[PDB]
């Protein structure tokens, strides 16, 4: 599922991401835009042989099981395919653990490089939230 911008903002807010670990909703929306283009089905291979999955590009090296990332962890205790669902529950719940891991939203490289330090409230402008 490819979410609309305000559609995703509303879902992320419902699931408790607005201000989670002090990150305002626009940070999360911006991150999703640049990680996945708002597409739950996005997958991307990494150089270490892990893959990033879903709307927030969650990595199989640590967070989910995809059966082809030897020596990896599964800290969200989910198959990585769960992160591709049109239902973003699993992705959100797992993102909460990630952003609590120590480095905050710097875990999302597109957030770091394209959202951090920018006017991220623009990403929710016009949304009835
Ligand atoms: Na894994």
Curated annotation (Swiss-Prot):
Subcellular location: Secreted
EC number: 3.2.1.17
GO MF assignments: beta-N-acetylglucosaminidase activity; identical protein binding; lysozyme activity
Pfam families recorded: Lys
CDD domains linked: LYZ_C
Positions contributing to substrate binding: 101
SUPFAM superfamilies in the cross-refs: Lysozyme-like
Tissue specificity: In the egg white and polymorphonuclear leukocytes.
Keyword Cytoplasm: no
Coiled-coil regions listed: none
Quaternary structure (record): Monomer.
Protein name in the entry: Lysozyme C
Organism of origin: Gallus gallus
Gene label: LYZ
